[PDB]
Design an enzyme around this catalytic site. Structure first.
Site, PDB file in Angstrom:
ATOM      1  N   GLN A 119       0.956  -1.046  -0.032  1.00  0.00           N
ATOM      2  CA  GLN A 119       0.007   0.020  -0.003  1.00  0.00           C
ATOM      3  C   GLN A 119       1.030   1.346  -0.097  1.00  0.00           C
ATOM      4  OE1 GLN A 119      -1.608  -1.080   4.067  1.00  0.00           O
ATOM      5  NE2 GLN A 119      -1.786   1.178   4.164  1.00  0.00           N
ATOM      6  N   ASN A 153      -0.938  -9.185   5.063  1.00  0.00           N
ATOM      7  CA  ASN A 153      -0.794  -7.734   5.180  1.00  0.00           C
ATOM      8  C   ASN A 153      -0.674  -7.294   3.699  1.00  0.00           C
ATOM      9  OD1 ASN A 153      -0.510  -5.386   6.536  1.00  0.00           O
ATOM     10  ND2 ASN A 153       1.209  -6.070   7.524  1.00  0.00           N
ATOM     11  N   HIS A 160      -5.966  -0.995  11.524  1.00  0.00           N
ATOM     12  CA  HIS A 160      -5.348  -1.632  10.518  1.00  0.00           C
ATOM     13  C   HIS A 160      -6.084  -2.735   9.772  1.00  0.00           C
ATOM     14  CE1 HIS A 160      -2.169  -2.463   7.525  1.00  0.00           C
ATOM     15  NE2 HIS A 160      -1.860  -3.584   8.003  1.00  0.00           N
ATOM     16  N   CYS A 182      -5.193   0.634   3.722  1.00  0.00           N
ATOM     17  CA  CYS A 182      -5.046  -0.841   4.225  1.00  0.00           C
ATOM     18  C   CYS A 182      -6.467  -1.387   3.890  1.00  0.00           C
ATOM     19  CB  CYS A 182      -4.670  -0.758   5.612  1.00  0.00           C
ATOM     20  SG  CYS A 182      -5.867   0.109   6.787  1.00  0.00           S
TER      21      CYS A 182
HETATM   22  C1  LIG Z   1      -4.727   1.696   7.005  1.00  0.00           C
HETATM   23  N1  LIG Z   1      -3.712   1.896   6.270  1.00  0.00           N
HETATM   24  C2  LIG Z   1      -5.448   2.739   7.915  1.00  0.00           C
HETATM   25  N2  LIG Z   1      -6.535   2.492   8.800  1.00  0.00           N
HETATM   26  C3  LIG Z   1      -7.681   2.348   8.505  1.00  0.00           C
HETATM   27  O1  LIG Z   1      -7.955   2.892   7.367  1.00  0.00           O
HETATM   28  C4  LIG Z   1      -8.708   1.631   9.611  1.00  0.00           C
HETATM   29  C5  LIG Z   1      -9.206   0.332   9.257  1.00  0.00           C
HETATM   30  C6  LIG Z   1     -10.186  -0.346  10.206  1.00  0.00           C
HETATM   31  C7  LIG Z   1      -9.868   0.006  11.502  1.00  0.00           C
HETATM   32  C8  LIG Z   1     -11.016  -0.554  12.216  1.00  0.00           C
HETATM   33  C9  LIG Z   1     -12.146  -1.328  11.758  1.00  0.00           C
HETATM   34  C10 LIG Z   1     -12.129  -1.351  10.469  1.00  0.00           C
HETATM   35  C11 LIG Z   1     -13.109  -2.396   9.681  1.00  0.00           C
HETATM   36  C12 LIG Z   1     -10.961  -1.086   9.569  1.00  0.00           C
HETATM   37  N3  LIG Z   1      -9.979   2.782   9.456  1.00  0.00           N
HETATM   38  C13 LIG Z   1     -10.424   3.166  10.682  1.00  0.00           C
HETATM   39  O2  LIG Z   1      -9.980   2.990  11.447  1.00  0.00           O
HETATM   40  C14 LIG Z   1     -11.912   3.938  10.285  1.00  0.00           C
HETATM   41  C15 LIG Z   1     -12.089   4.641   9.474  1.00  0.00           C
HETATM   42  C16 LIG Z   1     -13.276   5.174   9.588  1.00  0.00           C
HETATM   43  C17 LIG Z   1     -14.323   6.341   8.984  1.00  0.00           C
HETATM   44  C18 LIG Z   1     -13.977   5.980   7.432  1.00  0.00           C
HETATM   45  C19 LIG Z   1     -15.856   5.998   9.297  1.00  0.00           C
HETATM   46  C20 LIG Z   1     -13.828   7.767   9.312  1.00  0.00           C
HETATM   47  N4  LIG Z   1     -13.700   4.520  10.859  1.00  0.00           N
HETATM   48  N5  LIG Z   1     -12.703   4.207  11.241  1.00  0.00           N
HETATM   49  C21 LIG Z   1     -12.833   3.355  12.661  1.00  0.00           C
END
Ligand SMILES: *C(=N)CNC(=O)[C@H](Cc1cccc(C)c1)NC(=O)c1cc(C(C)(C)C)nn1C
Length: 220
Positions: free
Chosen positions: A19, A187, A163, A25
Site C-alpha cells: 500500500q 498484510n 489496520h 489498508c
Molecule cells: C490503514 N492503512 C489505515 N487504517 C484504516 O483505514 C482503519 C482500518 C479499520 C479499523 C477498524 C475497523 C475496520 C473495519 C477498519 N480505518 C479506521 O480506523 C476507520 C475509518 C473510519 C471512517 C471511514 C468511518 C472515518 N472509521 N474508522 C474506525
C-alpha cells in the site's frame, strides 16, 4: 471447522501487495476478500483495483489515504455496479479523482456480511466462505518488526483496531494438544515485511488484537 485452512493453496489469493505510505489498508483488505469471493463464484482469480476504491468510495464514507472501512468498500462496489481490475486501474499510493471505467470491471457484489464478534464465528466463516476482511491492532513496534512465529503482543487491544488485513486461513504449530493456534493473515506492506508479507496471529486467546471485532466479507 477443519483443524487447518489455507485458501492460498486453493487459488483464492493474489500475491502480497504494498500500500506504500497511503492509509489505504482498508482497500487492500476489501480487494483481497472480493478477489476470494469472485474466485469462488467464477473460478478465475483476478487482481482488483485498490486505487478504484481509494479514489471512488468517498460517497460510501471512505476517506482515501486518510482511512476507511472494508464494509464501505463493499457498499461502493454494490452501489457502483462494479470494480475495475488492478491491471486496468493501477495503484498509485495517493488519492486521485475517480476514473472508474465499466469496460474494465471484473467484479461485483450485492452487499456484505458482518461476522459475530468472536473467534468461533470467525473460524466458521474462514472455513466456509473464503478469505475474510478483518481489522487488527497493529500499533506496536513488535508488529512492525515481526519476522516469524505466532504474533502475541501483551499490549494488544481487542477494541482499538487500526489496520485492515485479510485472514486467509488458520492452523496450529507444535503438538496439537498445546493449543498453539494461529490465524494466517495477509498484510499489504509488501513481501519484505513479516513472513513473505504474512503474519501468523494468536488464535483462541479471547480475540487477541481484535481480529474478530470487525470481520466481514462481500456477498457475490
Ligand atoms: C490503514 N492503512 C489505515 N487504517 C484504516 O483505514 C482503519 C482500518 C479499520 C479499523 C477498524 C475497523 C475496520 C473495519 C477498519 N480505518 C479506521 O480506523 C476507520 C475509518 C473510519 C471512517 C471511514 C468511518 C472515518 N472509521 N474508522 C474506525
Amino acid at each position: 471447522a477443519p483443524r487447518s485452512v489455507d485458501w492460498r493453496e486453493k487459488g483464492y489469493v493474489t500475491p502480497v501487495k504494498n500500500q506504500g505510505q497511503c492509509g489505504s489498508c482498508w482497500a487492500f483488505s476489501a480487494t483481497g476478500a472480493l478477489e476470494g469471493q469472485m474466485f469462488r463464484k467464477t473460478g478465475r482469480l483476478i487482481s482488483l483495483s485498490e486505487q478504484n476504491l481509494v479514489d471512488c468510495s468517498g460517497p460510501q464514507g471512505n476517506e482515501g489515504c486518510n482511512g476507511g472501512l472494508m464494509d464501505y468498500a463493499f457498499q461502493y462496489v454494490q452501489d457502483n455496479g462494479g470494480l475495475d481490475s488492478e491491471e486496468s486501474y493501477p495503484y498509485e499510493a495517493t488519492e486521485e479523482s475517480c476514473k472508474y471505467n465499466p469496460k474494465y470491471s471484473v467484479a461485483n457484489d450485492a452487499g456484505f456480511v458482518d461476522i459475530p464478534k468472536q473467534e468461533k464465528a470467525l473460524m466458521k466463516a474462514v472455513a466456509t466462505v473464503g478469505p475474510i476482511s478483518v481489522a487488527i491492532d497493529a500499533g506496536h513496534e513488535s508488529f512492525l518488526f515481526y519476522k516469524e512465529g505466532i504474533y502475541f503482543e501483551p499490549d494488544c487491544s481487542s477494541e482499538d483496531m487500526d489496520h485492515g488485513v485479510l485472514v486467509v486461513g488458520y492452523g496450529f504449530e507444535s503438538t496439537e494438544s498445546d493449543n498453539n493456534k494461529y490465524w494466517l493473515v495477509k498484510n499489504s506492506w509488501g513481501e519484505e515485511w513479516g513472513m513473505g508479507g504474512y503474519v501468523k496471529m494468536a488464535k483462541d486467546r479471547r480475540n487477541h488484537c481484535g481480529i474478530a471485532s470487525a470481520a466481514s466479507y462481500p456477498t457475490v
